[PDB]
């Protein structure tokens, strides 16, 4: 019995237990190391203790780890004698089947060992067994001091010949999915032997400064039209910080201050509600559809946080539907007092632009609709947006529209799930209009166009979105960027959407299955590679 490590057990301790162990039959200095884990105290490791086992007179063997069959072996049992008297003993290997002894049997060899010395005896035994044969040698002692020893180490012989390794490197892709590995066909295959096969698969896996946008967080104030110029930038900044998770860089209390300000603004604009919820510039002054749509989109965006009433906005959406004409278009019953917050709307055409903005507004209002109830309202708003999309698609097919108009129509059709042909023609026109990270100090209109185009291309990123997003980022990095109001909100939404599109991770799984029809049956295997390498 010649182990390397045997005392491998776990027991409980009651301050005292006397376990009696049996020493393994070897001549070394065994070291015992223990670890105690206590529920109350904790973990301690014992100081190492050396339990030196020694026999005064012994024989030592070292069988080579590999011995080729049919080949000559040299066996060297060496005698160790630490006694005080010269010993004359005999050495003989017991006759064992499967081995040819040099003497071919139990034939003894005489040798005298002087005290404190060693004397080896050569042996030449060529193996003839198949896999492993046991061998024991006897060193029998004389009458003067009858001391003896016997060691029995199992001798293992390897198989015939040398070993061979075959490597089949391959690459895998989601075409050329299925591939077949040819079976073993090397003619040097030995009919008997081992056949171990292993599979080795390798995964081979491959912004704006928050400080500037923080200044846009402002308290609502002013009359019915000065209030939006402070809620829209505030809501945009809140959404940008929330969705880009830059609140950590800002002081911690800013977010709570932001939600307090947005609640105050929500209350401030809510008090100007008419009977139909159109939210005019003034209570006495006539309503404007552009203002109502702006309110619809901003309140729908903010509704995820403020505890508003969903039904009080459904009637606003219904009133907005009442302003649609026969072709699906929209016109303002009353223009805004100030055209500054219209920005890209003013130009050669407004009705196309106004309709695109309204279509964007309504689709943001579908989410706030309750899933239960208001089914006729949902169906009628879907019909309205279908008619509006038809009209905008006809206008886009007409072409000859402005860059702002083209971009906003493209975004409107993209977000409304327009028919594929109209989406294709609008996208083609927008790409034709694209001007060369140079694209489109820039005025408000140009950043309007770039933001809307970025939204469309995101809703349509392949070498294109990043290159124009860099331009938008460099333009916004200018001090006091986004001078107007709506450009601020859409550009912040654009950076948020672009940034989430840039930073997103998938499972990256490369599961494969291996199957074959062996003579012993059919087998299959599966190797997950979601997250390393497996064999």
């Amino acid at each position: 019995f010649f182990p390397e490590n045997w005392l491998w057990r776990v027991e409980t301790v009651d301050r005292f237990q006397i376990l009696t162990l049996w020493l393994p039959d070897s001549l070394t200095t065994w070291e015992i190391h223990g670890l105690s884990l206590s529920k109350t105290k904790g973990l301690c490791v014992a100081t190492p203790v050396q339990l030196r086992v020694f026999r005064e007179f012994h024989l030592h063997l070292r069988l080579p780890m590999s011995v080729r069959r049919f080949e000559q072996l040299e066996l060297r049992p060496v005698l160790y004698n630490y006694l005080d008297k010269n010993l004359t003993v005999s050495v003989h290997v017991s006759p064992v089947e499967g081995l040819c002894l040099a003497g071919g049997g139990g034939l003894a060899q005489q040798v005298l060992v002087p005290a404190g010395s060693a004397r080896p005896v050569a042996f030449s035994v060529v193996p003839t067994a198949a896999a492993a044969v046991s061998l024991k040698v006897v060193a029998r002692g004389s009458f003067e001091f009858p001391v003896g020893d016997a060691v029995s180490k199992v001798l293992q012989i390897e198989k015939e010949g040398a070993i061979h390794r075959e490597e089949l490197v391959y690459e895998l892709n989601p075409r050329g999915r299925t591939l077949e590995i040819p079976g073993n066909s090397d003619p040097n295959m030995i009919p008997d032997g081992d056949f171990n096969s292993y599979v080795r698969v390798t995964a081979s896996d491959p912004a704006l400064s928050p400080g500037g946008v923080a200044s846009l967080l402002r308290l609502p104030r002013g009359c019915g039209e000065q209030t939006m110029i402070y809620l829209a930038p505030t809501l945009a900044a809140s959404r940008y910080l929330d969705k880009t998770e830059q609140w950590s860089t800002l002081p911690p209390e800013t977010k709570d201050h932001a939600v307090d300000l947005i609640q105050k603004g929500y209350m401030r604009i809510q008090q100007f509600r008419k009977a139909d919820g159109s939210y005019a510039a003034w209570l006495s002054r006539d309503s404007s559809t552009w203002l109502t749509a702006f309110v619809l989109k901003v309140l729908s965006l903010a509704q995820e946080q403020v505890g508003g009433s969903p039904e009080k906005l459904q009637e606003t959406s219904n009133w907005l539907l009442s302003q649609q004409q026969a072709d699906g278009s929209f016109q303002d019953p009353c223009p805004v007092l100030d055209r500054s917050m219209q920005g890209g709307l003013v130009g050669n055409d407004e009705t196309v632009a106004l309709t695109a903005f309204v279509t964007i507004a309504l689709h943001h209002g579908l989410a706030v609709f309750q899933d239960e109830g208001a089914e006729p309202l949902k169906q009628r708003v879907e019909a309205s947006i279908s008619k509006a999309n038809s009209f905008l698609g006809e206008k886009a097919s007409a072409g000859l529209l402005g860059a702002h108009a083209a971009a906003i129509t493209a975004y409107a059709l993209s977000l409304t799930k327009a028919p594929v042909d109209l989406l294709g023609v609008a996208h083609n026109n927008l790409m034709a209009m694209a001007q060369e990270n140079l694209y489109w100090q820039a005025p408000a209109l140009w950043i309007e166009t770039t933001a809307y185009a970025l939204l469309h291309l995101l809703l349509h990123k392949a070498e294109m979105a990043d290159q124009a997003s860099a331009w938008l980022t460099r333009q916004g990095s200018f001090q006091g960027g986004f001078r107007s109001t709506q450009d601020t909100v859409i550009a912040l939404d654009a950076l948020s959407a672009y940034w989430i599109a840039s930073h997103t991770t998938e499972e990256r799984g490369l599961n494969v299955t291996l199957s074959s029809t062996g003579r012993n049956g059919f087998k299959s295997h599966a190797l997950q590679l979601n997250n390393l390498e497996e064999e």
């Binding site: 049996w22 393994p24 670890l35 050396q50 171990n196």
Partner: protein, 650 residues
């Protein structure tokens, strides 16, 4: 101008209670505050991301330590795993008294933190250090929490391969906190290093690894080791010491061996290329398992000139010695190596890590250093001299010199007095007689115009044992007598373990009782207010290794030199009911060729136990914010706040 103080370690750990400190100051003493603290994530609409807990303390008791728990169920409900750039979470303190009374902008104040899923302690162990292909590998695990107690969570055991590959994984929950497993190595794998890694199933980066290497081998019968006469060789011009080395060959059971030893020499460069000599090969006969080999200076010079390298080009070259002893009449042989033998121009090494940077004016600056010979134990009785050079902007740089002799543990404590209004301090530390080692550093004075600083001095200047009572003294510097009390905290393993207040006197001695909690290293941060500006200083204090608290004793029936086939009644002692995982290992495996990776001992337990420390550096800083951050603590007073740590490690 009252303020609220929020104190918390800069990094929180999921699944473990979090220590948070809240403080009151400049209170009219006639009012009581109440409020709650919790964790919330801004990106998910500030959902309460941890259970609520409140302090509701008064001015008479202005200090309160809160144990806030962070269950992982809220965390996965919290969408913390859904963040996109870094695990960044927000800690806040809500109380209506902050808004109505102080007229702040909101009734809340918080801090920015980084969370990590790493938690607990996981210890791995292997059946034997060296393997050869074709055997069965045994191993076991230990599940332990932050408080060093057995845990019953769920872990996943993973077995890595030689090529950084996975072969075998398992999942198991341990009711007994100890788990055993078997594993059979393939009989075809090439000789190389493997690895076993285990981590908690709920966690992600809480993995712990152990390395066992497999190599074709047969266990030897005796080991040979080469012990040089001196671990270092002086290569200073003019004088060269003699090189001598002793060859010791012993049987694995302690008896001496006889035979002939053969040695060859060479040179080792930085990367590891070998360049041997010719004609230097010495063959000698062993006597009582001992043999002494020396080379004269003349023959060494002849070898260098024959190789044409030059004596002056031994700046970092390593002398190479190989042993080829053959035991007769056995006939077998084995090798040994002496790679760790450099050519150095100085016999001593200088450590300058413990001494603090960021000097404080008006207080006695302290210099700490550790003298130790190369590749050896710390040495004692070595004089060390310093040349302090104060850089006074308004006068000539004064040079102050002072020496002191090694205490015995290798450490030096030489206080030096520094005057006011200095620009910087430059000093040179020289230790050795003769051939001293030179190590020079400079430190800049803190910017002027700020409030008075704080000074911490340690009288005994020795690392106390566990159970003692270390003492510290505090004194203010500059015209800052406005305050009336001192605030001090004790940090250990990134946890606020003790908090207390002390009044002002001429001498302010503060006593701390070191216990098993404060091990192996505890920080100590204290601060006071110069009206509104916080000012603080910190001092890292090391703790001696001590001993265990479970008191495991293992012993045998004395040294009777037992024979094979006999029986030994083992004796073992424990202080409490516990489970002991005994392991018997042959020493000859250590003799087998390997890097001789040390088995598990108290050192690694302490190192992993302290691996959760956040702060880095000896301590001390220019501004209160900088020193507070460098001590691994998050600070927020309502006007000044700590920036988030840029990464998990310093």
């Amino acid at each position: 101008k009252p303020r609220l103080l929020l104190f918390s370690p800069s990094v929180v750990h999921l699944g473990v209670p979090l220590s948070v400190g809240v403080q009151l100051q400049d209170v009219p003493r006639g009012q009581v505050v109440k409020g709650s603290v919790f964790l919330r994530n801004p990106s998910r609409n500030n959902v309460p991301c941890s259970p609520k807990v409140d302090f509701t303390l008064s001015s008479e008791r202005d200090f309160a330590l809160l144990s806030l728990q962070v269950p992982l169920k809220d965390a996965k409900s919290c969408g913390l795993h859904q963040l996109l750039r870094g695990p960044e979470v927000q800690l806040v303190a809500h109380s209506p008294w902050l808004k109505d009374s102080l007229s702040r902008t909101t009734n809340i104040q918080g801090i920015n933190l980084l969370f990590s899923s790493r938690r607990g302690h996981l210890f791995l162990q292997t059946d034997q250090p060296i393997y050869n292909p074709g055997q069965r590998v045994r191993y076991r695990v230990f599940a332990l929490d932050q408080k060093m107690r057995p845990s019953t969570d769920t872990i996943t055991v993973m077995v890595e391969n030689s090529h950084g590959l996975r072969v075998r994984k398992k999942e198991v929950y341990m009711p007994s906190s100890i788990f055993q497993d078997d594993f059979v190595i393939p009989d075809i794998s090439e000789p190389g290093t493997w690895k076993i890694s285990a981590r908690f199933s709920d966690g992600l980066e809480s993995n712990s690894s152990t390395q066992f290497e497999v190599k074709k081998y047969v266990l030897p019968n005796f080991e040979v080791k080469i012990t040089p006469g001196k671990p270092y060789i002086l290569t200073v011009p003019g004088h060269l010491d003699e090189m001598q080395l002793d060859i010791q060959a012993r049987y694995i059971y302690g008896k001496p061996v006889q035979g002939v030893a053969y040695v060859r020499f060479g040179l080792l460069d930085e990367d590891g290329k070998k360049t041997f000599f010719r004609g230097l090969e010495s063959q000698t006969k062993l006597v009582n398992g001992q043999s002494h080999i020396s080379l004269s200076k003349a023959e060494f010079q002849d070898a260098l000139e024959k190789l044409n390298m030059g004596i002056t080009d031994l700046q970092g070259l390593r002398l190479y010695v190989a042993a080829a002893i053959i035991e007769s009449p056995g006939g077998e042989m084995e090798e040994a190596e002496l790679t760790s033998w450099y050519f150095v121009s100085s016999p001593f090494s200088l450590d300058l890590s413990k001494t603090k940077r960021h000097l404080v004016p008006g207080a006695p600056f302290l210099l700490q250093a550790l003298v130790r010979e190369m590749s050896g134990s710390p040495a004692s009785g070595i004089p060390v001299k310093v040349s302090a050079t104060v850089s006074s902007p308004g006068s000539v740089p004064e040079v102050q010199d002072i020496q002191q002799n090694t205490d015995g543990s290798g450490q030096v404590s030489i206080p030096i007095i520094i005057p006011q209004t200095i620009s910087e301090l430059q000093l040179s530390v020289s230790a050795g007689s003769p051939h001293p080692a030179i190590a020079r550093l400079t430190v800049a004075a803190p910017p002027s115009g700020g409030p008075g600083f704080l000074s911490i001095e340690r009288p005994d200047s020795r690392p106390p044992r566990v159970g003692d009572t270390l003492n510290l003294n505090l004194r203010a510097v500059g015209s800052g007598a406005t305050f009336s009390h001192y605030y001090y905290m004790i940090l250990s393993r990134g946890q606020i373990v003790f908090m207390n207040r002390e009044p002002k006197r001429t001498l302010t001695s503060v006593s701390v009782f070191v216990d098993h909690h404060l091990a192996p290293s505890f920080y100590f941060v204290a601060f006071y207010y110069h009206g509104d500006h916080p000012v603080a200083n910190s001092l890292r204090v090391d703790v001696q290794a001590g001993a265990c608290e479970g008191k495991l004793e293992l012993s045998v029936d004395g040294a009777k030199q037992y024979r094979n086939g006999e029986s030994v009644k083992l004796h073992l002692e424990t202080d409490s009911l516990a489970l002991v995982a005994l392991g018997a290992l042959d020493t000859a495996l250590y003799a087998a060729g390997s890097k001789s990776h040390k088995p598990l001992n108290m050192g690694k337990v302490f190192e992993a136990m302290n691996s959760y420390d956040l702060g880095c550096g000896p301590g001390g800083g220019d501004s209160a914010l900088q020193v507070f951050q460098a001590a691994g603590l998050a600070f927020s007073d309502g006007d000044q706040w700590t920036l988030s740590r840029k990464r998990l490690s310093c």
